[PDB]
């Protein structure tokens, strides 16, 4: 499924996930716009070390979901990485609420940093009623 803007803004706020781990919605909104162009059936191979990232957030399966084929992978989430390709985002949410409760936080995504760290992110979220 691709997600309109505020389809998906109103979705993760009933999810519980403005201001989870001091995230506010406007950057995860950034993250998923980032990542994916809101879409939930997106998957990328990284070639350079056997891993797959999948869904609306582009987790990894290295360390949140397991694929089966990526080598010396953990399976935090202890989600299939099919369950991330589903249109009802749920467990993709629950799973990037996993990520984030990492040190790292939003920082765990690469994209975070060079796309939405220290910028107006509000423009995500404007117009959306939440
Ligand atoms: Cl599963
Ligand atoms: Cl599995
Ligand atoms: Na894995």
Partial sequence: KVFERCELARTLKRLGMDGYRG????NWMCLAKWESGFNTRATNY???DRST???????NSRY????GKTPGAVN??????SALLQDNI???VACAKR???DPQGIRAW???????QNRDVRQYVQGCGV
């Fill in 23 to 26: 995230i506010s919605l406007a």
């Fill in 46 to 48: 990284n070639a350079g």
């Fill in 53 to 59: 990232d999948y869904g609306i957030f582009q987790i």
């Fill in 64 to 67: 949140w979901c397991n694929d």
């Fill in 76 to 81: 935090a989430c202890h989600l299939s990485c």
């Fill in 90 to 92: 749920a467990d993709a």
């Fill in 99 to 101: 990520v984030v409760r």
């Fill in 110 to 116: 690469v994209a975070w940093r060079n796309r939405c």
